[PDB]
Design an enzyme around this catalytic site. Structure first.
Site, PDB file in Angstrom:
ATOM      1  N   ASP B 140      -4.276  -8.717   1.867  1.00 51.67           N
ATOM      2  CA  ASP B 140      -4.074  -7.269   1.955  1.00 51.67           C
ATOM      3  C   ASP B 140      -2.782  -6.830   1.248  1.00 51.67           C
ATOM      4  O   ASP B 140      -2.059  -7.626   0.648  1.00 51.67           O
ATOM      5  CB  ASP B 140      -4.105  -6.815   3.422  1.00 51.67           C
ATOM      6  CG  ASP B 140      -5.533  -6.586   3.943  1.00 51.67           C
ATOM      7  OD1 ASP B 140      -6.489  -6.753   3.162  1.00 51.67           O
ATOM      8  OD2 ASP B 140      -5.713  -6.262   5.137  1.00 51.67           O
ATOM      9  N   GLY B 165       6.255 -20.117   0.729  1.00 51.56           N
ATOM     10  CA  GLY B 165       5.945 -21.248  -0.124  1.00 51.56           C
ATOM     11  C   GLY B 165       6.803 -22.446   0.235  1.00 51.56           C
ATOM     12  O   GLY B 165       7.971 -22.316   0.605  1.00 51.56           O
ATOM     13  N   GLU B 188       5.040 -13.159   9.209  1.00 55.56           N
ATOM     14  CA  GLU B 188       5.564 -14.150   8.279  1.00 55.56           C
ATOM     15  C   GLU B 188       5.403 -15.545   8.878  1.00 55.56           C
ATOM     16  O   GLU B 188       5.996 -15.842   9.922  1.00 55.56           O
ATOM     17  CB  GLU B 188       7.033 -13.842   7.943  1.00 55.56           C
ATOM     18  CG  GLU B 188       7.583 -14.559   6.700  1.00 55.56           C
ATOM     19  CD  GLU B 188       7.228 -13.918   5.358  1.00 55.56           C
ATOM     20  OE1 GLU B 188       6.963 -12.699   5.310  1.00 55.56           O
ATOM     21  OE2 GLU B 188       7.199 -14.646   4.341  1.00 55.56           O
TER      22      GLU B 188
END
Lengths: 258, 266, 260
Positions: B140, B165, B188
């Protein structure tokens, strides 16, 4: 009514058309309805006698517009994209931008089928299809106006603010931000919650349908609605044993226009 | 097998060639591994017999692709950029787009060297190199799938979601969102935390390796892993003295095959 | 030196000229200041003998550039925009990029009138006019450097981090991130708050001027300033009745995974 009826009847018999086989009367009306949402003459939801009412045939038009257009390539000189929804401002002349009075700061993008009124400033941000952003509202950096959301006049969506899109269920009110509301940075109003006019949402306030909103003066807990003139900051509510706290939105003061 | 061994020995000898004086033998192999990451035949991490395994040699290939490419200007008609990583879809034909089954909603960008499967919808967002996004997943608006992250089938990354990452520690499993997961907005998941399949993360949940994860039924504290079918909302834990509380993620329910997002979080 | 005074008198009498009937003395100077902010020779705020000072005439020049420029169309091959502030890297040659030492990862954008130093990495992000980003600073994906904000050397703005812009009131120090700071993802430092060098802000910390900053060892509550080398995590403070708790930023240590 004459256009409205063709949309709703086409939606009932929608398992009979693709992007390839579809009679041009139905393409014309869907194209007619998107155009109306795009210039604000139509809106997915409006306030009638103090109650927000959803106009389902426009949600059905938006869905039909997905059914009847395939994905096509969209080309920047070195970046490529692939989607079936045109962007709002592609092919717009300079005379057109001036006339709408909307500032589109690069790389802002809106989808065709959304409305922005005069003196809207779109900082780098996204406005999805079916949304209505009213006069003088500031969409700040990396803010999102989701699909069918209704944003009032002189609204400030601070940076990183997300207004959640509601397309289906067809009976659902979209997310609504009323006039003169300040939403602080990194805040998120989703799932059809209504923030009534004049409210002040601090930074980091996440409000969905499950989000409990505690009034620290009354102690009453309501859901899905921020009463007008509320000042809402993020907080927590302790559990019965006091071993943990769960997230909540706390109303900390109330202010009329003056 | 022959490529797995070839990448690793050059990575040990990376202090002897640059982007200019690299043997074209070295440049061809990295592109094959980059190409394989881009079309999903290679993946930085995959699940083998119920256990997630990291293929460090693929992290090493990605690092090498940074060494061997300089920054080049990248041209949109009026906006200019300058980077050493190509974007994934530049030069893609309509036939290539049709076959891949991926919707790239403008201005979304993915870097070349990442994979998206059929029925993935990329709203305006960023997918970084080495990441793998599986069938039917919705990325999104203003979401980030960080480098080497593995996102499962039929996952919903809501708007403003960040998947951090993991490249730096070569031995680390990257961040993994397993199948049938809902990550709510502004959330997150970073540093290789694993979210096991079927879980439901409410809005505003930040989970790293240091993050405490409280099970409100058991009293157990987990780190780095959300057990399958967990429903996690953001919360707080009081301090010893009760003068303050520190941030924590709270597990408030557990489910089997019960999937209602809004009533499941109450 | 002579340029600063030209801006200020044009700003004081700005109700008497428009973008059309503007004397070229005033337009030439505002463009000279925008040019100077873009390459880092000027800055809206700098640190002088340990004290940060704001150069209000550069804030005034920025405003005039808004006043003296109309909106023009800005075109990508299929996407269009409409704005009065030019893009920073538009028309830059390959030699121009190489010289600056900035990596601009697509689709990151900076406005003309902002500075980025050598070895700054711009992931997809936004840098607004008047901001200064110093050597070796990493701006991550969907981060925002607001207007006139000053970011130090070797700073990490994690993904989704917003540094709040301050343009008016003119006498205000902008939002300042000092050297060697780590701002965790989804954080927001706004309203001219300063983060002093060496600090470590966890994920999910929001700091404005009204935000309470609780030092859990001293019990003292500070506002608008993060003392150097603080480790800040998000937390809550109880109310008198304990029926609820409200948001606050908590300092848990003072000085990578071991810290938080």
């Amino acid at each position: 009514s004459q256009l409205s009826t063709i949309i709703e009847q086409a939606f009932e018999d929608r398992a009979n058309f693709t992007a390839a086989d579809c009679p041009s009367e139905i393409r014309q009306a869907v194209e007619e309805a998107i155009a109306g949402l795009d210039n604000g003459t139509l809106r997915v939801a409006e306030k009638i006698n103090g109650e927000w009412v959803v106009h389902q045939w426009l949600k059905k038009a938006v869905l039909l517009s997905f059914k009847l257009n395939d994905n096509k390539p969209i080309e920047s000189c070195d970046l490529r994209f692939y989607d079936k929804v045109e962007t709002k401002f592609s092919g717009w002349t300079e005379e057109q931008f001036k006339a709408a009075g909307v500032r589109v700061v690069p790389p802002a993008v809106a989808r065709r089928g959304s409305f922005q009124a005069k003196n809207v400033v779109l900082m780098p941000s996204y406005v999805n299809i079916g949304a209505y952003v009213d006069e003088g509202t500031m969409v700040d950096t990396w803010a999102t106006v989701g699909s069918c959301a209704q944003i009032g006049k002189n609204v400030h969506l601070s940076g990183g603010v997300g207004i959640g899109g509601v397309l289906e269920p067809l009976q659902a009110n979209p997310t609504i931000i009323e006039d003169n509301c300040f939403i602080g940075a990194r805040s998120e109003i989703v799932e059809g919650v209504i923030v009534e006019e004049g409210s002040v949402i601090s930074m980091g306030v996440y409000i969905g349908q499950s989000t409990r909103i505690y009034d620290r003066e009354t102690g009453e807990i309501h859901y899905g609605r921020v009463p007008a003139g509320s000042v809402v900051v993020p907080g927590n509510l302790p559990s019965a044993d006091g071993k943990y706290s769960l997230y909540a939105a706390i109303i900390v003061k109330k202010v009329d226009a003056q």
